[PDB]
Amino acid sequence: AVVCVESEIRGDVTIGPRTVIHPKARIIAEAGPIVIGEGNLIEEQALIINAHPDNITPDAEDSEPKPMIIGTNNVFEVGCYSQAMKMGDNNVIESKAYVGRNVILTSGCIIGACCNLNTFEVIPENTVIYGADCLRRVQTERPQPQTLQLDFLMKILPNYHHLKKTMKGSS
């Protein structure tokens, strides 16, 4: 993976292969061990979080001892954060996506612009939300978890592949 010197990580994060983290990739995985996936591209200005501390104060039996995870082809773009997103296969997060706490991001997840993810909501597969229309379950089969949106994600991943080699060569 492209372990960029500018990619600011924090804590024990046993990453995976092909997890090209771009410059200024501020993250945090200390209170929760976030394992990276295979085939993503952590862009600039991101924010990976782990175990929302006592500022919010979870006064509901804080005995978490649970680590975050990632998946394949789930490249998150700039602006968008990552508040412990239990992703999967090809769950791309576009610009300025306000990542929510308990959103088990399944496949075919196209996190649109300025779409604040729903806390404690099981993000099923094959669903792309609309921008202004929050929670729009539009394109139930067009944004299909496999062969349609994941195929488009692997197609967008080609530019990420060329950029992965280019960033590994430019550094």
């Binding site: 729903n118 909501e121 229309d133 929050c134 929670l135 729009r136 379950r137």
Partner: protein, 369 residues
């Protein structure tokens, strides 16, 4: 020559059209939503001022044909289509805008029912008018409207939304975003209406009887048909409530109010030289009533009320037909007036000009000429 304008009086929608235009043009909600507007301004605003509404009309028509086709209507005529019961002051205020502000060549009032007849172009027919707020059974025998055969049920689409919001305000069987049972008061009317309009399939008569049984002292209301929601709050509850709306749509419970009721009223004013004709003329129309599967509940109630003891003498044994609409959803009067205005250059003389409106400024309805 040129085309013309084709606009009707719609509380919810007032489309525009040209002369002999084959196919729809553009539908837009009748309310006017402007800049810095918290709530759009309607059209059915009676006993309200005339200058503010006058202005709204000016710029709305302005941008209306702009974003429609950017045409210059100071060149072609207008086909005004009516919807009775509206105050003529309002109608003439529209005319005031038209002529005294925009100065179009000529305008011409017309009935929507005429265009509905023009869909088939026959002489005698029943009128199954089902508008946005009311209905109307004012038959057109020999191509002539039947005057005293009138009536209207003020329980249209708008009141249907009122019924919906009533039922759902009573029970919030949706979740939070855990159920939020009647926590807030305002409703997303667009979402509500999306659920409603996107799920309008009429159910069986027997199912309505089940609803009636549920009114006092129930057999399987689901699989219930009702359209997804939003706002992180979606649900799958009884869609049978819309069938409850269909039941309250026709109330005989010490009310005796229905569409068939007005058909009966017409029959009361009908003379023998109209009865069998209308039995043939089972005209199938209605604007907002685009009710899927309504033939069942409809026909069943028709041939359910035929059996009324006080009406067998009036009816006898009259069978009916299905005068199917070759037109579409509500384009009926729209396109009817479109092709109706096509070669009516002849009737362009009947189209009221601004010329005579200068020295006149008035169009007479049933008044002293």
């Amino acid at each position: 020559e040129k085309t013309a304008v084709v606009i009707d009086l719609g509380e919810a929608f007032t489309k525009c059209g040209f002369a002999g235009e084959t196919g729809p043009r553009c539908i837009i909600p009748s309310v006017i939503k402007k800049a810095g507007m918290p709530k759009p301004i309607k059209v059915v605003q009676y006993n309200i001022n005339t200058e503010e509404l006058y202005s709204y009309l000016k710029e709305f028509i302005h941008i209306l044909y702009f974003r429609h086709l950017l045409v210059n209507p100071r060149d072609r005529r207008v086909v005004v289509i009516e919807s009775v019961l509206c105050p003529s002051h309002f109608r003439e205020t529209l005319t005031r805008v038209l002529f005294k502000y925009f100065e179009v060549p000529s305008v011409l009032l017309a009935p929507s029912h005429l265009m509905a007849l023009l869909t088939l172009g026959i002489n005698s027919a029943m009128v199954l008018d089902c508008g946005y707020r009311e209905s109307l059974v004012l038959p057109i025998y020999e191509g002539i409207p039947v005057l005293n055969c009138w009536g209207a049920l003020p329980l249209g689409g708008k009141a249907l939304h009122k019924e919906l919001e009533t039922q759902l305000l009573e029970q919030c069987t949706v979740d939070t975003g855990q159920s939020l049972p009647s926590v807030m008061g305002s409703i997303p009317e667009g979402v509500l209406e999306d659920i409603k309009v996107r799920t309008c399939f009429v159910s069986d008569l027997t199912r309505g009887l089940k609803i009636q049984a549920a009114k006092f002292n129930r057999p399987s209301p689901p699989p219930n048909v009702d359209y997804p929601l939003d706002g992180e709050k979606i649900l799958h509850v009884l869609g049978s409530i819309r069938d409850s709306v269909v039941e309250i749509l026709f109330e005989q419970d010490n009310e005796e109010k229905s569409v068939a009721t007005l058909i009966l009223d017409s029959l009361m004013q009908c003379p023998i030289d109209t009865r069998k004709q209308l039995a043939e003329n089972l005209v199938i129309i209605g604007g907002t009533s685009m009710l899927p599967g309504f033939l069942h509940r409809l026909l069943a109630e028709i041939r359910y009320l035929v059996e009324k003891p006080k009406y067998k003498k009036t009816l006898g044994t009259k069978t009916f037909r299905i005068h199917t609409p070759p037109a579409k959803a509500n384009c009926v009067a729209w396109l009817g007036g479109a092709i109706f205005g096509a070669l009516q250059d002849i009737l362009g003389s009947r189209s009221v000009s601004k010329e005579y409106y200068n020295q006149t400024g008035r169009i007479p309805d049933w008044c002293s000429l």
